[PDB]
Design a protein around this ligand. Sequence first.
Ligand SMILES: C/C(=C\CNc1ncnc2[nH]cnc12)CO
Ligand SMILES: C/C(=C\CNc1ncnc2[nH]cnc12)CO
Ligand SMILES: C/C(=C\CNc1ncnc2[nH]cnc12)CO
Ligand SMILES: C/C(=C\CNc1ncnc2[nH]cnc12)CO
Ligand SMILES: [Ca+2]
Length: 157
Amino acid sequence: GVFTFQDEYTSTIAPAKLYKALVTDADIIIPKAVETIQSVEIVEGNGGPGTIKKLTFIEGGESKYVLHKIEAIDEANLGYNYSIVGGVGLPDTIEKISFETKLVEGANGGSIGKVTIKIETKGDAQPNEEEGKAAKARGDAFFKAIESYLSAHPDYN
Ligand SMILES: C/C(=C\CNc1ncnc2[nH]cnc12)CO
Ligand SMILES: C/C(=C\CNc1ncnc2[nH]cnc12)CO
Ligand SMILES: C/C(=C\CNc1ncnc2[nH]cnc12)CO
Ligand SMILES: C/C(=C\CNc1ncnc2[nH]cnc12)CO
Ligand SMILES: [Ca+2]
């Protein structure tokens, strides 16, 4: 089956600046900002489509990682699309999970981070609800941490 979900994250940070932090400077800013992410590293590629990034994080006390494959990267339109192409642990009901993200102008000069999540399962298997909730909660924490960090360090590098 194919399932879609929509998240929106509000930020006080202006969209092009937030995109720069999330995308262009991800490898530097994200580990600094996000207290559960230890590193964001390029495994292969030049930064364009097909690039694989390894994001190492702590969960339940254990060091784990996920691999992201860049599907599209469009700074002009503040777009970034990627898929998850590896991780730690046994297979589950997800055959594939991918993301289409866009940043747009929000309130008082801030942003809204839009995310469409596409989950593909085998046959009539359903997405795991607890996981979706946890994933969204991580998304909230991720944007909060980035907002707090960029508020405290509006300049950098
Ligand atoms: C940090 C990574 C993915 C999470 N990125 C984003 N997650 C959510 N919204 C966004 N807008 C621009 N980039 C993103 C690395 O693939
Ligand atoms: C897999 C299911 C929910 C998991 N998804 C979400 N759970 C919580 N908040 C959300 N916002 C957009 N999607 C979600 C429904 O069983
Ligand atoms: C911040 C991001 C994703 C977090 N949201 C979700 N990630 C995974 N599954 C889900 N179901 C509903 N929302 C989600 C994109 O990088
Ligand atoms: C890009 C994001 C998170 C990086 N992925 C994860 N970050 C932290 N703990 C996890 N458990 C499963 N996946 C993760 C957005 O929340
Ligand atoms: Ca960190």
